[PDB]
Subunit: 212 residues, 5 copies
């Protein structure tokens, strides 16, 4: 349809893509997790596999437009390949991430973006004691791989992981799940790097479907 | 041949591709499933693997042509990469979908499209009790990942899953399989999203071929 | 090299690619299978894994040239991606096909093409009884995914599957294997679709002292 | 922003890419390892799986700029695909490396580059005796695949592998881990080749988190 | 530096790529193997996994240059994607080959090319008896997939497989390894095809690393 095609052409076909954030022009990315399933634990390797949706939000001036000039369009869907996306990376993964959903973002006229890819990830986690009442706790940090806090900052809208889509008949049940902004330093570099620490306490489900 | 070459050049060379549906120009996608095989169950991870053909139909004004101007061509096969396709997604997969067939669509002169890829998918399903007379029931929802009901609506032509190509010597026999349109909300967003709920009841095959 | 470079340039840079067959201009694809190895059976999922070569042949007028104009070149090898290839698909696979060879076709001056990829495929097959004298029978159909018999017809040169390269120390011995043209229908469409039915009878190979 | 866009355009859009080092113009690559986890040992195949971050540094004249001409920009992040990178290779791997992080480098105005990809690698290692107090030692060499020491020299900044991020609840604990420059020869060619020898001594962890 | 950029531009930016050999202009490809490890045997499927480096050499007139015109450059490294490469294929593989090294070749001013990728391959091999003194023998043939002996003449410089980099603590020790040229015919075609037969006799390693 005509106005949207016009908008996309104007946004994407007449300027260099945004070169990412800088010290002079930093960016804050909002992160939120929807934990869908703990699929698998491996006690011989201390890896656990999660399926989650990773909600990402940020805003770029270069993605702004006046809806009046585009038939009142206030937002649109577009392939995530058409726009800059933050290098938010799980820091304790053991396998490359597996993408389970289309990668398509929603862009709004004020230059804000929402992007929520579904992912399966194997990560470092010792599941010893998962078949007990107390269960086990594991944690996983997410943050920019390459940008320090001087270029990319992070925040969560809530410290409570969204569990409203958690698979009720998973082999594992969630005792608690939080997502908390933290600061980290790595050996390579003097500067502070921001992460969101996903902390999940869980155990083998012993009630519900399959259990009598 | 010559006329088809002209038609494909005229449709695919001279205009921007359809930017997807919008609130002002929504799209209805028709879905239907042909369930070919339940291949595997995993009771240590509560994952089940299906092979199915997913029939998708939709119509675009931008894909219309006058057959009179193209040697009376009324339809053609074309690579799915050549056209917009809907982002219909299984919401409870645990691995990336595996495509088992070419991805080629049929486009008709009225702009309607038929596209039927074969896929293998692992999804969240507790198979406990599958080896019993009563079997087990699992459900899997399919819908747009990024578009609400305001942009993409779904429908089925029948609520019965097509079982006429179901593998007769599968480990698992199908007791029932339905596909039903429904409405869902996710935490990220306040708008209604539409899905098709695929509900399959099954058990270990204990009769037929290989059972004397 | 020079003559061949000119031929490939002239064939592939001057006109749109063949858009595939139509009712007005159908195409017949010849298929033949060489079974190399039954690698694995899985009795917990009823899947069997085969390694085979699939010989495909067809002919397109748009691939014709006069050898006199190209230093008497009568055929050439080229990447299969440079030409149209038919969408011949195993209908009962359970995993994406794994290609084990380069995908390069031979094109002949009369427009005929030969293309023989090596593939490993997992497919739907109940292996119960494979460890018995009678063994087991499994079948796999191959045909176009999207074209009916009005656009793509199939044929074989023989109904005898080529077993001359079958791995002799396989876990499984082949009793027989046939490849036969058939007509099939599927729910989506009312038109006849053509396939080649590959039927393999096999059993465990237990005897062998190297 | 504007100045960075100018800089990237100038560096990347007007000259052929650096064609790699030569005898006349050799390059020294500094290497360092951050060992994050020994994930798995396979005693039936003598393969061991590591997760590590591989820190690579080098300097090119062609990547220099005057910060004064570019709004006082002194460094920037850019996709590793935008620049030449060294073909540093694990010589005893048994599976293709799996990349676990974005591949983005930092380029500084003096032409220096820092690139630190996270990787999972299976390599040749006999883990017999890992379950004892003395543990086992394995070695893995890293070097250019195709350049001799006439074109690529290697250096470490320290002979101590960085263990500050080692996963505390790994199945395996590290007894020692060193990284040492060496000079090796291969049958194909007569020239001196340079490697970095990663030597890890480790055993099954039987103390700490998960142990009471 | 400057001279190499000139050379690569001159070689790669003006003429069509070599279209492969023909009967009128056949090509000799020299093959040699460096056997690094027998990683795994599978007695359930009769597959064995090897790691080897496959040394390939051939010469093209179109890759020649006068060193005098290019600052005395007599050879250079270049991505294998920049040049034509022969379709040398393992004939009894059971999985797609996995590449373990960069794919970069060395081109010399006389037009000759050296290219040595490291690979892991699963192939057809019955390992029954590998745990004995006499061990077991398996053979794997390599040759062009599509070119007969009239287009590609395969040669070896030696029938001795290079064992100088064989992993000393492999599960399997090598008793002998030879590489032998032979003529094959395939049912499809009347022409002779040339292959190299890699024949490896091996057994379970019962002495070496530890083996106290
Ligand atoms: N993410 C930890 C390593 C790291 C910090 N800053 C970086 C910049 C570039 C890079 O490739 C890697 C890094
Ligand atoms: N499908 C669930 C998440 C979701 C809803 N709307 C979306 C829009 C864009 C996106 O990447 C993701 C979403
Ligand atoms: N490599 C055995 C089959 C074979 C012989 N010649 C060929 C030519 C093309 C092709 O795809 C395959 C072949
Ligand atoms: N091959 C079975 C499904 C089928 C028949 N005709 C088709 C046309 C297009 C398509 O995507 C799929 C089909
Ligand atoms: N060091 C691995 C073998 C080797 C040495 N020099 C090389 C040059 C090119 C190549 O592909 C491979 C090599």
């Amino acid at each position: 349809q005509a106005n949207l095609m016009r908008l996309k052409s104007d946004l994407f076909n007449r300027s260099p893509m945004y070169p990412g954030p800088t010290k002079d022009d930093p960016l804050t990315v909002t992160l939120g997790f929807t934990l869908q399933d703990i699929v698998k634990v491996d006690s011989s390797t201390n890896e656990v596999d999660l399926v989650y949706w990773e909600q990402q939000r940020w805003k770029l001036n270069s993605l702004m437009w006046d809806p009046n000039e585009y038939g009142n369009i206030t937002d649109f869907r577009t392939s995530a390949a058409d726009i800059w996306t933050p290098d938010i990376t799980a820091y304790e993964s053991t396998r490359p991430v597996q993408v389970l959903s289309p990668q398509i973002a929603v862009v709004t006229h004020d230059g804000s973006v929402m992007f929520i890819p579904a992912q399966r990830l194997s990560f470092m986690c010792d599941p010893t004691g998962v078949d007990s009442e107390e269960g086990v706790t594991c944690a996983l940090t997410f943050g920019s791989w390459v940008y320090s806090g001087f270029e990319i900052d992070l925040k969560t809208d809530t410290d409570q992981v969204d569990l409203s889509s958690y698979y009720a008949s998973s082999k594992y049940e969630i005792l608690s799940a939080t997502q908390t902004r933290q600061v980290q330093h790595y050996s390579c570099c003097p500067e502070p790097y921001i992460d969101v620490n996903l902390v999940v306490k869980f155990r083998e489900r012993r009630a519900g479907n399959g259990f009598f």
